[PDB]
A paper describes a structure:
Bacterial transcription initiation is carried out by an RNA polymerase (RNAP) holoenzyme comprising RNAP core enzyme and a σ factor. ECF σ factors comprise only a module related to σR2 (the module that recognizes promoter -10 elements in group-1 σ factors), a module related to σR4 (the module that recognizes promoter -35 elements in group-1 σ factors), and a short σR2/4 linker that has no detectable sequence similarity to the σR3/4 linker of group-1 σ factors. For example, the Mtb ECF σ factor σL mediates the response to oxidative stress and regulates its own synthesis, polyketide-synthase synthesis, cell-wall synthesis, lipid transport, the oxidative state of exported proteins, and virulence.
We prepared “downstream-fork-junction” nucleic-acid scaffolds containing P-sigL sequences, analogous to the downstream-fork-junction nucleic-acid scaffolds containing consensus group-1-σ-factor-dependent promoter sequences used previously for structural analysis of group-1-σ-factor-dependent transcription initiation. Because the P-sigL transcription start site (TSS) had been mapped only provisionally, we prepared and analyzed a set of downstream-fork-junction nucleic-acid scaffolds having different lengths—4 nt, 5 nt, 6, or 7 nt—of the “spacer” between the P-sigL promoter -10 region and downstream dsDNA. Transcription experiments indicated that all analyzed nucleic-acid scaffolds were functional in σL-dependent de novo transcription initiation at the expected TSS (with the initiating nucleotide base-pairing to template-strand ssDNA 2 nt upstream of dsDNA), and σL-dependent primer-dependent transcription initiation at the expected TSS (with the primer 3′ nucleotide base-pairing to template-strand ssDNA 2 nt upstream of dsDNA), with highest levels of function observed for a spacer length of 6 nt. Robotic crystallization trials identified crystallization conditions yielding high-quality crystals for spacer lengths of 4 nt, 5 nt, or 6 nt. X-ray datasets were collected at synchrotron beam sources, and structures were solved by molecular replacement and refined to 3.3–3.8 Å resolution.
Author numbering:
A (entry chain E): 28 to 108
B (entry chain B): 1 to 233
C (entry chain C): 28 to 50
D (entry chain D): 440 to 1011, 1026 to 1170
E (entry chain D): 1220 to 1281
F (entry chain C): 443 to 1129
G (entry chain A): 2 to 226
Write the structure that this text describes.
RNA sequence: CUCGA
């Protein structure tokens, strides 16, 4: 019911605020998952028990903050407040 | 001059008779040069056919209301103006539309002489009141662009004939905007975006290809003057 | 003329009042 | 988005660029990768684009008055050495483009980028947190451009003509695309009234009801409209399902739409809709013919006649000073009212003589920029100018700037102009000082609980009843009633409750109580919120910027403090009056108050003033002593005389203002109670900002007063 | 006393601070800014700060 | 900056300093205009910063008596009779009389036309008074303004607010490569340039014997020769290019006191603070949105707003504890490619273009062995390079600088050059950049109409006139009627008439609007120069009449209408603009606020030794200050991690900042912020 | 109301200015065609200009030559007025030697085979008795406007002084249309293109280059997907 | 000290 979100607007900030209690809570959900995705890319070549990889399909050279923000939108993550 | 490479044309199809075209990448700042020109060529230089004037039986000096139908006179003209039609004959042709009795009139209830084609038979035209009758005569001509009814004042016979705006052009609405793309670390290279909404007479692809032919012919007049070098790839 | 004292270019002034004392 | 120079980004993202230069094997090691960035090898410009991809940056312009003084953007690599800023965030930054500079800050950690992407992004902060009204809206050229196409012009070409004679109706187009083709050839004008069959715009809820009503209008259904082609192009920018508006787009009209868009439609729609207004406004502002020429500065036709009538009246007051019938101190006051009355007659002579096509009028009357007082000074007369003393000069500047001031006229004008700039540096100093005082006193006020559950609240004057019988809307609804939440069900004369307790007072929910006859509501307030340290969310209400209930953890105190100190740049009462209230000082007015309700005993003389009050119940007479230099406030009396000047025998209530001025807030507490003194300070501070054109919600003023009454003193240990 | 010494009258607050031997519980916006702690507001409160995120049991095969 | 800025600086009157007053004790009464300042101190020219009112400029005709008070001249009126006798009156001497305003209607004999005339009286009173009461009258209308203020044409149509900025920004003009005198002048431009002292005036009359780009020789009538040497490409105090150029040719008879050569911001002896630009007053697609400016790329292609700038770079070779700093081409661990632009001494060679980071002077300083990092001593062993006890301390080009090396000056203790004790060699390298006008460079006019360049469109994109000539600059309309500076609109009108020329209808007499104009104004040739003196000059009645008789172009067509507007064509689409637009010529100046200097960025860099926070200022390669007010904005957002991040790892965390830089180049995550070293110092100071 | 193919006929005013009438164009079509030619004329017409120069006694712009009245900066600005055409399409060197009293003009330059100077009367410098001017001029061929190529980007050594190159030979382009708005069956626009060059090429040659540029470009819409 | 918003 809106124009296609372009650039950093996507995923729409309105739908992301639905899977979360407040603006401040969405920040920690995305950032803590972004650190997991970033540690998977740096521990994929070495070490076992590496963190769970990107749940959605990532784009080429996509920032881990953007990967984490898309999968929060896709209801693939949980939380604990 | 020098070589300027990689300009390509891509098409995104919104609907069957409306597509978006992107010409990329035009070197800065051509996007505006061939931008407004491509639009005006589409809107004003594609041959099409449309109703030139109509004549309604029972309507002579009033033009306020037609008895036996809910629609008044001007509402008939609107749905008739939006009637999409094509002709293979250059000369003007007259088409008659008649239907009686309670019911509904359509553009399929029209009888088309040979050579003319009605592309939207399901288009509503008028609702017939009980024991209602409607006779109307339509005049179809070939032309390009949009010509007002006032110029068709002489075309109408002095017997209840009314002229109408003629939407000859097959394309309905064209808009364009120019953005920026970086070919080689230069952010000024222009990218042209064309949005063409057309009738079902032709698709946006052929409407654009028609505009390209008529423009190459147009600038061919200048090209014929000397045949010198120019930035080309 | 304006400032016809050093030999400068002739700038034409919209002056209705005479200048009694030079700068 | 924002455009920052390529050379800036390379140094800003230098360690990130070095990382990728060794990944893509443009550089052998990280050591040589650093030398590549310092030498600007051609590989870095291709790599730099990959690096800044969806990595937000922070833009800031000093002074940082409110929180929107820093906003996050998505960087886009542009050539040149200047920062490219979006034209809609200029209101938030108070940023013009006459040499301003901004700072860029790069968040590194994942949490810092997430705070920039969600909390600080410019698209997520369209509304002002101080008032709730939008800021990123068409402001200058944009509002003029939109005001152009949404104007109905009678004699404009291509207009509608009723069917007369042999020709039928002229100027009725089957499609807006046809009206475009008509205006393209040159038959129709974009500002001409026509009839168009629309198929992709929801009709007004008024006429959608009579055409459909049973079911909402559907994309594809047709209907007729009596607009202009431009008004149709304007409504196309607004989203589908928004009721068509056939009005002329003043700035007030556009602000009302965007405020309604922010309340109902989601955030991403509001952000994208205003970009369409921006692009469209600029397009038509370019083609609106708005130009300033010496010919367009029209002079009043009766300019000579008007001044001679007042030069005569000034010559008679000058002759009435020659015979000594007027005091010298009175002659100046007498001549001032002659020229104050003269400058009004010249200003009125301009409004009627100026057409509405003239661009100088079109700019001002569209909400674009400027006052008519500027236009009157520009074409009519400057008027009375102030000398560095303060009072107006007994002689006015009769010339206009179009005519050309004389040597003496120009010289006397500079006196007020220089002292105007001079105190603007001092008035900002006391403003910024009052702001930082408000910050430290409320820095630790946070929303820590969802609901403190106290049914306590306060009564808000929603509207005023009338002798005529129709309720009159109270002026204080915007700042004191909207965005509140209820603590008591609103009950009309019927048993039905209109709005439940704990419901955020939206725009229609105020008309629900308005159309119900009830003129008073009890709302939850941050004052009555009983929480140990912070305040509960239910008592705060709607976050003006978010348009929803305040989140738990938002530092509402700092937001409230900045909200009050940002407009403090513009005052005269005045700014010291605001400091007298927030510092709980014994004011200059020092107005008396009625300590006990009862009967008034006015014992006025001329040497002095003494007034007693017989207590209406028990007690003994309470004697005061006041100077005759004050005057009694017109008190609403019990027998229906609202303008009843206080004479003996009136029935005043407890804690009622006696004489005019400012009642001592220290004494207001020790009379009516802590609940009432907080209400006094709120709408007393609000009257200083309201009397200047600044709308701050009472919520923010209340957050400060809550910190002033959190302490009590000890009488007995 | 740390939030006050950075506002006004630095010596007047620091003198009365050492006399009464006041101890400051570092729980406040102005205080945590100085020492470098997360401010107890917004994303700094314990409600949003200590949060665990884990993927749902549905997982990819590759 | 320019000759006007220098001339104004010498005529400044400053309240601050010893014996005067403190800036903290100057109230709002010392700073504002006093009625005794008439004809003595300017009421317009004063800075708008914290020094407003405290610094003024002396009025034009004013002078100082040996006592210390400022005198201003007046024409003594005996008995309603204007006399050519002129006497200077002090401030209190002026109050004991009454003086008539300069623009008094006066008989050819001297008698006032009206019995009652506008007259100034003691205590700043203005009123009519009998003609037999006028004791004196003003010399010139412009008697009350400063020299810079008197250079603003149609000043009487601009409010004092923007008039102040107009004079203050004229002193900020940058000397361009070539200079053009303005079409619309005030007459003051000539004397302002001559009296400033940056031109070359002939001392004695004679003929030009020899003229070169280096010097001009004048053969006097008596027989003696005086030779004037030209100052060529010299760096000014503020980095502007002071360059003089000869005007006369071989064998030209030159009178005494005549300009034979002019320097920066001078054209034929007149103040040329800018260029004449074809301006259109219209909004244009938002690129000129509130005070932004759109420029035609012609100003770039033709060096119209191009200016030369010169920077001075310096380094010295001292005596250290372990030896002596030596300037040498041999620099440890540097290729022969970076040192390729250096001569055998280690100095960059004249003419070499040098970007930022290039070596200008190769200096090495001996560093002790006990000063070596553990890794550096290992890194020295794993490369086998012995005898490198010296480190690199070469003079490099700062960030944001680039240009041609134009001059080198070397000072050596060995060669009798007196250096400070402890120095053995001193080198100064002069670098000159040729700065075209860029996006963001600050332009301005003479009426306080300032703005940065928002967009430099190609010449074809610019809205062009009927004969294809595109405009040069597009000024937004919205920023005109707010500021009350119609002078720019009136200059634009008179500017066009000057560009085209005019011919008034002489048949059937002189028309009723041109009766007051001098006969020299009835006919004008294209590109004519005119003077609009302050408080005198062109009236709107005559300006309206000139637009009606503007000369046609070469094709015979009149482009601008009697209103002053013309029909423009949108160069981006081709459709003509729907309404006529005011078009003319306006004098625009390039102010010394260019993005080439005002852009700065920093990843990491130096830190202040004591506080361990980043340095300040661009010159020290420092970072921006996230101030106290800015931290309130973070907290208002609830951006806790951004706030902690700014004040720790990005600032004064000694270990966090290094570990963050490693975490970025490693691709790891950002580590946890530590404790600020600045807070550690606070505790050690409370102790 | 049916098609008649448009025709273009040249009108000459002087040796470097010509008017072109194109008719019959559709209504409203005339303004857009004139612009699309004007934009291509003012920008993308191939021409030759001087890339860099080299004066013997100097090493950079900011200096003087003994005996000449103009500094090297002012000499280079006068050299920006030079109009020149080159057949080689590759870098080629012009020479200029003059000495003694006199004025150096553009005609004093000796161009190599293929390159020719089109205004031999342009003032360059004034020389007195002691003045000698020896200048090399590298002339390349491109289009539009290219700024001076850096010495760090080029292989040019210290003596070479790069200059901005203005390649376009077109001087001033405009157009006008005459709309036939008589209410009748026949309406048409007549475009009048006005082109002025700088004697490097004739006006019809420039319009031919802009024609072949646009014919090539608009051919991108004719190809199907 | 001098200036820029
Ligand atoms: Mg500003
Ligand atoms: Zn509460």
């Amino acid at each position: 019911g809106y124009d296609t979100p372009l650039g950093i607007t996507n995923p729409p900030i309105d739908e992301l605020l639905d899977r979360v209690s407040s603006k401040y809570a969405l920040v920690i959900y995305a950032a803590k998952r972004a650190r997991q995705i970033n540690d998977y890319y740096n521990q994929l070549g070495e070490g076992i028990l590496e963190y769970v990889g990107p749940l959605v399909e990532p784009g080429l050279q996509e920032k881990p903050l953007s990967i984490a923000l898309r999968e929060i939108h896709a209801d693939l993550l949980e939380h604990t407040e | 001059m020098l070589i300027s490479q990689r300009p390509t044309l891509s098409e995104d199809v919104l609907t069957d008779n409306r597509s978006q075209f992107v010409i990329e990448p035009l070197e800065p700042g051509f996007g505006y040069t061939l931008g407004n020109s491509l639009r005006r060529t589409l809107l004003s230089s594609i041959p099409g056919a449309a109703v030139t004037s109509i004549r309604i039986d029972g309507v002579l000096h009033e033009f306020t209301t037609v008895p036996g139908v809910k629609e008044d006179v001007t509402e008939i003209i609107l749905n008739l103006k939006s009637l999409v039609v094509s002709s293979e004959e250059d000369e003007p042709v007259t088409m008659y539309l008649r239907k009686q009795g309670p019911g509904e009139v359509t553009a399929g209830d029209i009888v088309p002489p040979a050579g003319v084609t009605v592309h939207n038979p399901g288009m509503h035209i008028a609702t017939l009141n009980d024991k209602g009758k409607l006779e109307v005569e339509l005049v179809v001509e070939r032309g390009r662009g949009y010509v007002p009814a006032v110029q068709n004042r002489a075309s109408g016979a002095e017997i209840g004939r009314i002229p109408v705006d003629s939407i000859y052009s097959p394309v309905l609405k064209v808009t364009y905007k120019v953005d920026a793309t970086r070919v080689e670390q230069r952010t000024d290279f222009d990218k042209l975006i064309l949005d063409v909404e057309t009738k079902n007479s032709i698709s946006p692809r052929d409407a654009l290809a028609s505009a390209g032919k008529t423009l190459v012919e147009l600038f061919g007049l200048a090209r014929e003057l000397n045949v010198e070098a120019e930035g080309i790839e | 003329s304006n400032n016809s004292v050093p030999g400068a270019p002739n700038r034409v002034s919209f002056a209705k009042l005479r200048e009694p004392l030079e700068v | 988005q924002c455009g920052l120079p390529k050379l800036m980004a390379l140094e800003l993202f230098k360690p990130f660029v070095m990382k990728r230069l060794v990944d893509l094997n443009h550089a052998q090691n990280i050591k040589s990768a650093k030398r590549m960035v310092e030498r600007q090898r051609p590989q870095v410009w291709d790599v730099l684009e990959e690096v800044i991809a969806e990595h937000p940056v922070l833009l800031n312009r000093a002074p940082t008055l409110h929180r929107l003084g820093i906003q996050a953007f998505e960087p886009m690599l542009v050539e040149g050495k200047a920062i490219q800023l979006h034209p809609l965030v200029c209101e938030a930054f108070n940023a013009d483009f006459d040499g301003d500079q901004m700072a860029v800050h790069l968040p590194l950690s994942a949490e810092a980028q997430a705070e920039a992407r969600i909390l600080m992004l410019s698209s997520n902060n369209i509304l002002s947190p101080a008032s709730g009204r939008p800021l990123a809206m068409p402001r200058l050229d944009m509002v003029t451009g939109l005001y152009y196409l949404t104007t109905e012009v009678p004699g404009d070409t291509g207009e509608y003509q009723p069917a007369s004679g042999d020709h039928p109706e002229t100027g009725v187009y089957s499609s807006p695309a046809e009206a475009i083709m008509a205006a393209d050839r040159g038959v129709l004008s974009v500002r001409a009234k026509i009839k168009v069959r629309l198929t992709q715009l929801r009709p007004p809820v008024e006429i959608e009801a009579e055409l459909f009503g049973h079911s909402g209008w559907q994309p594809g259904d047709a209907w007729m409209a009596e607009t202009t082609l431009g008004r149709v192009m304007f409504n196309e920018l607004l989203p589908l399902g928004y009721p068509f508006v056939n009005k002329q787009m003043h700035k007030k009209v556009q602000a009302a739409i965007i405020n309604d868009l922010a309340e109902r439609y989601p955030m991403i729609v509001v952000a994208q809709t205003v970009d369409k207004l921006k692009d469209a406004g600029f397009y038509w502002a370019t083609r609106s013919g708005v130009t300033v020429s010496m010919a367009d500065v029209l002079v009043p036709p009766r300019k000579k006649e008007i001044l001679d009538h007042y030069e005569e009246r000034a010559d008679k007051v000058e002759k009435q000073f020659q015979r000594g019938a007027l005091n010298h101190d009175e002659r100046n006051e007498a001549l001032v009212e002659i020229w104050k009355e003269a400058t009004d007659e010249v200003g009125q002579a301009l409004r009627e003589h100026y057409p509405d096509d003239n661009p100088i009028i079109t700019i001002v009357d569209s909400g674009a920029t400027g006052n008519f007082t500027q236009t009157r000074t520009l074409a009519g007369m400057k008027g009375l100018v102030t000398n560095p003393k303060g009072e107006f000069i007994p002689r006015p500047v009769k010339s206009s700037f179009r005519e050309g001031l004389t040597v003496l006229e120009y010289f006397i004008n500079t006196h007020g102009a220089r002292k105007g700039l001079a105190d603007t540096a001092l008035r900002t100093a006391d403003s910024g000082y009052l702001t930082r005082r408000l910050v430290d006193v409320s820095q630790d006020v946070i929303v820590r609980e969802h609901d403190c559950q106290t049914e306590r609240g306060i009564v808000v004057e929603l509207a005023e009843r009338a002798p005529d019988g129709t309720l009159i809307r109270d002026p204080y609804i915007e700042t004191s009633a909207y965005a509140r939440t209820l603590g008591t069900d609103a009950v009309d004369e019927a048993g039905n409750v209109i709005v439940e307790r704990g419901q955020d007072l939206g725009d229609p929910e105020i008309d629900a109580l308005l159309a119900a006859g009830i003129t008073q509501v009890k709302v939850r307030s941050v004052l009555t919120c009983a929480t140990s340290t912070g305040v509960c969310a239910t008592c705060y209400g709607r976050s003006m910027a978010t348009g929803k209930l305040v989140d738990i953890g938002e530092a509402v105190g700092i937001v409230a403090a900045q909200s009050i100190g940002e407009p403090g740049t513009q005052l005269t009462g005045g700014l010291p009056r605001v400091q007298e209230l927030f510092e709980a000082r014994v004011p200059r007015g020092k107005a008396p108050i009625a300590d006990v309700t009862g009967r008034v005993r006015l014992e006025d003389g001329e040497r002095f003033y003494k007034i007693t009050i017989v207590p209406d119940d028990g007690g003994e007479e309470v004697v005061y002593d006041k100077i005759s230099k004050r005057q009694r406030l017109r008190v609403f009396k019990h027998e229906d005389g609202s303008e009843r000047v206080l004479s003996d025998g009136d029935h005043v209530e407890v804690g009622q203002q006696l004489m005019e001025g400012s009642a001592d807030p220290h004494e207001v507490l020790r009379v009516q109670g802590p609940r009432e003194v907080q209400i006094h300070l709120v709408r007393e501070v609000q009257e200083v900002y309201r009397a200047q054109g600044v709308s701050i919600h009472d919520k923010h003023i209340e957050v400060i007063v809550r910190q002033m009454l959190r302490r009590v003193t000890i009488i007995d240990s | 006393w740390l939030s006050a010494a950075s506002f006004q009258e630095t010596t007047r607050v620091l003198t009365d601070a050492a006399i009464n031997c006041r101890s400051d519980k570092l729980n406040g916006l102005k205080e945590n800014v100085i020492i470098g702690k997360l401010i107890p507001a917004g994303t700094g409160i314990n409600r949003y700060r200590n949060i665990a995120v884990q993927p749902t049991e549905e997982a990819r095969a590759a | 900056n320019n000759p006007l800025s220098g001339l104004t600086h010498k005529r400044r009157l400053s309240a601050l300093g010893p014996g005067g007053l403190s800036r903290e004790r100057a109230g709002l009464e010392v700073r504002d205009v006093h009625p005794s300042h008439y004809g003595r101190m300017c009421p317009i020219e004063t800075p708008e910063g914290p020094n407003i009112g405290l610094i003024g400029s002396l009025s034009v005709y004013a002078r100082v008596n040996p006592f210390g008070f400022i005198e201003t001249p007046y024409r003594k009126v005996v008995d309603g009779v204007v006399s050519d006798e002129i006497v200077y009156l002090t401030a209190d001497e002026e109050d004991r009389h009454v003086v008539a305003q300069a623009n008094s209607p006066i008989d050819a004999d001297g008698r006032f036309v009206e019995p009652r005339v506008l007259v100034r009286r003691k205590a700043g009173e203005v009123e009519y008074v009998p003609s037999s009461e006028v004791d004196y009258m003003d010399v010139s209308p412009r008697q009350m303004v400063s020299v810079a203020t008197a250079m603003i044409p149609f000043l009487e149509h601009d409010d004092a607010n923007r008039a102040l900025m107009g004079a203050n920004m004229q002193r900020q003009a940058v000397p361009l490569v070539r200079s053009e005198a303005p079409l619309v002048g005030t007459g003051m431009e000539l004397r302002a340039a001559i009296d400033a002292g940056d031109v070359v005036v002939a001392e004695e009359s004679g003929v030009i014997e020899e003229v070169s780009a280096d010097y001009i020789t004048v053969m006097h009538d008596n027989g003696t020769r005086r030779t004037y040497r030209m100052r060529k490409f010299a760096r000014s105090n503020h980095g502007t290019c002071a360059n003089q150029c000869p005007i006369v040719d071989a064998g030209d008879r030159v009178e005494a006191g005549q300009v034979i050569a002019d320097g920066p911001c001078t054209d034929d002896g007149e103040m040329a603070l800018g260029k004449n630009l074809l301006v259109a007053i219209m909004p244009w697609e938002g690129h000129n949105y509130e005070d932004a400016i759109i420029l035609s790329n012609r100003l770039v292609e033709e060096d119209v707003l191009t200016s030369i700038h010169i920077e001075e770079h310096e380094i010295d070779a001292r005596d250290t504890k372990l030896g002596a700093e030596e300037i040498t081409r041999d620099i440890p661990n540097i290729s022969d490619e970076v040192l390729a632009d250096l001569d055998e001494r280690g100095i960059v060679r004249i003419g070499a273009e040098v970007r930022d980071g290039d070596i200008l002077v190769g200096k090495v300083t001996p560093k002790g062995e006990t000063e070596l990092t553990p890794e550096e001593r290992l890194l020295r062993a794993i490369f086998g390079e012995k005898a490198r006890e010296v480190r690199d301390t070469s003079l490099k080009v700062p960030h944001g600088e680039s240009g041609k090396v134009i001059g080198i000056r070397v000072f050596s203790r060995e060669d009798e050059d007196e250096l400070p004790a402890g120095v053995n060699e001193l080198v100064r390298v002069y670098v000159a950049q040729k700065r075209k006008i860029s996006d963001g460079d600050k332009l301005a006019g003479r009426h306080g109409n300032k703005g940065v360049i928002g967009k430099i469109l190609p010449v074809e994109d610019m809205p062009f006139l009927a004969d294809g000539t595109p405009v040069d600059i597009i000024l937004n309309t919205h920023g005109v009627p707010r500021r009350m500076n119609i002078g720019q609109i009136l200059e634009t009108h008179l500017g066009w008439c000057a560009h085209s020329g005019w011919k008034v209808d002489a048949a059937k007499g002189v028309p009723d609007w041109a009766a007051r104009l001098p006969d020299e104004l009835l006919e004008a040739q294209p590109n004519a120069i005119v003077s609009t003196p302050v408080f005198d000059g062109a009236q709107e009645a005559e300006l309206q009449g000139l637009l009606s008789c503007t000369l046609p172009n070469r094709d015979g067509d009149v482009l601008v209408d009697a209103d002053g507007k013309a029909m423009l064509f949108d160069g981006r689409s081709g459709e003509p603009f729907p309404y006529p637009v005011t078009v003319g010529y306006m004098y625009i100046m390039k102010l010394h606020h260019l993005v080439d200097d005002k852009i700065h960025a920093r990843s990491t860099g130096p830190y202040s030794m004591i506080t361990q926070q980043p340095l300040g200022g661009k010159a020290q390669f420092g970072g921006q200050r996230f101030g106290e007010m800015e931290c309130w904005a973070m907290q208002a957002y609830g951006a806790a991690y951004t706030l902690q991040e700014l004040l720790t790892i990005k600032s004064d965390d000694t270990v966090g900042r290094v570990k963050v830089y490693e975490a970025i180049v490693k691709g790891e995550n950002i580590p946890e912020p530590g404790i600020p070293e600045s807070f550690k110092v606070l505790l050690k100071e409370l102790q």
